[PDB]
Design a protein around this ligand. Structure first.
Ligand code: TQO
Length: 134
């Protein structure tokens, strides 16, 4: 057993708050915000050795990242930003930092009760998204 066991599996979005405002703060344009805000993604997390894979599947986009904790990678986000990302585990929370154009956003994923809670922060704006097991 290991590092991310309680994250592994298939998760479905059940609530969102403040996500349009988070996307505005990131710089996402109107049409992408509307369609992405409507999305109801499933998040699929798996681990093979030291490699963690996180997929987000929705009617808007299907994305996939694979990474090693603490080891930076280049990522194309669903809104087509080219970012440099690093994901670490900090006290049981997966912390995903994206850097681009002198900007930074952090996405935190944690287990709370039977939920996987996702907190997205861009300057002073936070969005909270809650997932349950599918
Ligand atoms: C456009 C974005 C700025 C691109 O990056 C994210 C970062 C936070 C993610 C939060 C989560 O996993 O629920 C989110 C997932 C998602 C939402 C809607 C459609 C497809 C994927 C993707 O926010 C919207």
């Amino acid at each position: 057993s290991h590092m991310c066991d309680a994250f592994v599996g298939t998760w479905k979005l059940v609530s969102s708050e403040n996500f349009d405002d988070y996307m505005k703060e990131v710089g996402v344009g109107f049409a992408t915000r509307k369609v992405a805000g409507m999305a109801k993604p499933n998040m699929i997390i798996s681990v093979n050795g030291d490699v963690i894979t996180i997929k987000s599947e929705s009617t808007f986009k299907n994305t996939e990242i694979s990474f090693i904790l603490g080891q930076e990678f280049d990522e194309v986000t669903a809104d087509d930003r080219k970012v440099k990302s690093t994901i670490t585990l900090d006290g049981g929370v997966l912390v995903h930092v994206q850097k681009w154009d002198g900007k930074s956003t952090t996405i935190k994923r944690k287990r709370e009760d039977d939920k996987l809670v996702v907190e997205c922060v861009m300057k002073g704006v936070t969005s909270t998204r809650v997932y349950e097991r599918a």
